[PDB]
Design a protein around this ligand. Sequence first.
Ligand SMILES: *[C@@H]1O[C@H](CO)[C@@H](O[C@@H]2O[C@H](CO)[C@@H](O[C@H]3O[C@H](CO[C@H]4O[C@H](CO)[C@@H](O)[C@H](O)[C@@H]4O[C@@H]4O[C@H](CO)[C@@H](O[C@@H]5O[C@H](CO)[C@H](O)[C@H](O)[C@H]5O)[C@H](O)[C@H]4NC(C)=O)[C@@H](O)[C@H](O[C@H]4O[C@H](CO)[C@@H](O)[C@H](O)[C@@H]4O[C@@H]4O[C@H](CO)[C@@H](O)[C@H](O)[C@H]4NC(C)=O)[C@@H]3O)[C@H](O)[C@H]2NC(C)=O)[C@H](O)[C@H]1NC(C)=O
Ligand SMILES: *[C@@H]1O[C@H](CO)[C@@H](O[C@@H]2O[C@H](CO)[C@@H](O[C@H]3O[C@H](CO[C@H]4O[C@H](CO)[C@@H](O)[C@H](O)[C@@H]4O[C@@H]4O[C@H](CO)[C@@H](O[C@@H]5O[C@H](CO)[C@H](O)[C@H](O)[C@H]5O)[C@H](O)[C@H]4NC(C)=O)[C@@H](O)[C@H](O[C@H]4O[C@H](CO)[C@@H](O)[C@H](O)[C@@H]4O[C@@H]4O[C@H](CO)[C@@H](O)[C@H](O)[C@H]4NC(C)=O)[C@@H]3O)[C@H](O)[C@H]2NC(C)=O)[C@H](O)[C@H]1NC(C)=O
Ligand SMILES: [Zn+2]
Ligand SMILES: [Zn+2]
Ligand SMILES: [Zn+2]
Ligand SMILES: [Zn+2]
Ligand SMILES: [Zn+2]
Ligand SMILES: [Zn+2]
Lengths: 209, 209
Amino acid sequence: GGPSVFLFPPKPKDTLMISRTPEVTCVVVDVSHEDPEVKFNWYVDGVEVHNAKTKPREEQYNSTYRVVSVLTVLHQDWLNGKEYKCKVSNKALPAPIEKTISKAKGQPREPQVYTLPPSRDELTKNQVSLTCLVKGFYPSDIAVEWESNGQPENNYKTTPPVLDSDGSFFLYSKLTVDKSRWQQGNVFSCSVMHEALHNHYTQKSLSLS
Amino acid sequence: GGPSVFLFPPKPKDTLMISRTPEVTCVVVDVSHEDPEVKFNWYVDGVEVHNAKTKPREEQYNSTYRVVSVLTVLHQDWLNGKEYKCKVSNKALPAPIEKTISKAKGQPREPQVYTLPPSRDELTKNQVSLTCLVKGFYPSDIAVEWESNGQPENNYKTTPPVLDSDGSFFLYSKLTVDKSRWQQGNVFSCSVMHEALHNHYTQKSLSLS
Ligand SMILES: *[C@@H]1O[C@H](CO)[C@@H](O[C@@H]2O[C@H](CO)[C@@H](O[C@H]3O[C@H](CO[C@H]4O[C@H](CO)[C@@H](O)[C@H](O)[C@@H]4O[C@@H]4O[C@H](CO)[C@@H](O[C@@H]5O[C@H](CO)[C@H](O)[C@H](O)[C@H]5O)[C@H](O)[C@H]4NC(C)=O)[C@@H](O)[C@H](O[C@H]4O[C@H](CO)[C@@H](O)[C@H](O)[C@@H]4O[C@@H]4O[C@H](CO)[C@@H](O)[C@H](O)[C@H]4NC(C)=O)[C@@H]3O)[C@H](O)[C@H]2NC(C)=O)[C@H](O)[C@H]1NC(C)=O
Ligand SMILES: *[C@@H]1O[C@H](CO)[C@@H](O[C@@H]2O[C@H](CO)[C@@H](O[C@H]3O[C@H](CO[C@H]4O[C@H](CO)[C@@H](O)[C@H](O)[C@@H]4O[C@@H]4O[C@H](CO)[C@@H](O[C@@H]5O[C@H](CO)[C@H](O)[C@H](O)[C@H]5O)[C@H](O)[C@H]4NC(C)=O)[C@@H](O)[C@H](O[C@H]4O[C@H](CO)[C@@H](O)[C@H](O)[C@@H]4O[C@@H]4O[C@H](CO)[C@@H](O)[C@H](O)[C@H]4NC(C)=O)[C@@H]3O)[C@H](O)[C@H]2NC(C)=O)[C@H](O)[C@H]1NC(C)=O
Ligand SMILES: [Zn+2]
Ligand SMILES: [Zn+2]
Ligand SMILES: [Zn+2]
Ligand SMILES: [Zn+2]
Ligand SMILES: [Zn+2]
Ligand SMILES: [Zn+2]
């Protein structure tokens, strides 16, 4: 074994928001010193493209260097399932290394988003859990955040998506707030980004009552 | 590199129910043919024990054999944090291989278990999601199942435990049932096994209203 290549997708939020810039990232590790230069070729559905920015080669505390090539991806292209290929070439190895990536494939399914208020019993306490159920979505790439009366409520945690029995995915997000805010009647909103939603975004709000 | 050892815990439910028999499992892989015999020593907190059942050595479709040693563990011992050691000895390697395992460590915290009924909107549908929140537990080993009017309802899925902001864990379980059963008023119960509960078991029931 010589050098290795790893091809990384963009982050899901970058793919879902037009104002962001998704990019895909090809990385080669275990490049030697004696035969140490390397060329990256990039293709989008088999046709070569030339706008990748490759980063200053850089040495590891082990015997190797590493070099990253970053390719900007169009919102459309990525969500339309275009395939991205990184070809890496070295004298140090027999044939160039070939990696491909695209968005998770499969018919898309829109999430159903449901907010659930605290249980009776939890209203014995100093804090309460506000719950967002997101289910029936496909593919599993998704983002969830909470907001109130405008601003983001950063005391929440979200489970990973769980494959459901029908082949779609669900998850839950749990927002914790002082029981006061809840009874003061404040408005909390669970907001969800996923490719199959209209404009890849939806929100559901929750309020005492 | 020669042979490798892997030491596996019991299953959480086996540890939590007295009627079950938890056992821990030591496995050696990449045993050679030329120097191929092996001895297992087992210790519970540093003192040797002699009741492990070691299995018929067995050959791999690659160049190696594999041999498993299984040690029965007492309910108490495992939940009281006793440490289990598998020592594996071979001529094929310099010194014997040493592996230790015990229950996840850390002060235990009892789960709070809360059932949440369907959202308004979900009651537009042919099916409804019944929700069990389990939170504040430690360590993360846990089991959840649903039952109704006696029997187990096997159309449910449970998220993995998620580390929460206070260092405890939570999860959600989602049971789906025909909207009818729900309105027919049936009784559904979320049941939870975890070491910090009284008798390692608790249940919470859910019913229309
Ligand atoms: C000398 O030292 C070097 C260290 O400098 C050694 O290099 C390391 O070698 C390993 C050899 O395996 C490398 O591979 C492992 O790593 C990847 C995952 O790496 C990421 O995460 C780790 C942190 O855990 C980081 O160290 C890396 O930097 C990576 O971080 C991500 O970087 C990305 C690039 O920037 C980020 O993506 C971008 O993020 C941007 C954010 O600013 C932006 O969002 C962009 O849009 C986005 O593109 C990403 O965010 C970073 N994430 C984090 C959290 O930081 C791992 O995938 C490799 O595993 C796969 O391969 C093995 C091969 O058999 C599998 O067994 C393994 O399970 C796994 O998956 C398998 O692979 C195939 C596909 O190849 C699957 O189809 C299989 O199904 C699957 N197997 C199974 C069972 O399912 C691997 O674990 C390691 O990354 C190297 N380190 C670095 C820094 O590169 C070198 O080895 C040393 N040499 C010697 C001789 O010892
Ligand atoms: C020749 O062929 C053989 C195949 O026959 C090759 O052997 C394989 O070699 C691998 C070398 O790594 C082995 O290790 C991997 O496997 C374990 C996990 O194995 C389990 O799961 C897989 C399925 O994915 C099965 O194949 C195994 O059988 C194991 O299944 C479990 O068996 C247990 C024993 O029965 C079960 O437990 C019992 O279950 C009972 C149920 O009846 C009962 O409940 C008992 O109570 C209970 O005890 C269990 O249920 C079975 N589960 C399932 C789902 O079936 C894996 O852990 C190894 O990974 C660790 O080690 C590497 C080392 O670096 C890590 O990088 C890796 O991440 C991982 O964790 C790391 O390790 C350390 C601790 O060592 C951690 O502290 C680190 O932090 C951690 N790393 C990180 C990043 O966090 C590894 O993946 C593989 O198991 C072998 N197969 C078999 C069958 O043994 C052999 O290699 C070949 N030879 C050559 C030369 O090629
Ligand atoms: Zn070019
Ligand atoms: Zn639309
Ligand atoms: Zn779009
Ligand atoms: Zn003995
Ligand atoms: Zn008690
Ligand atoms: Zn007990």
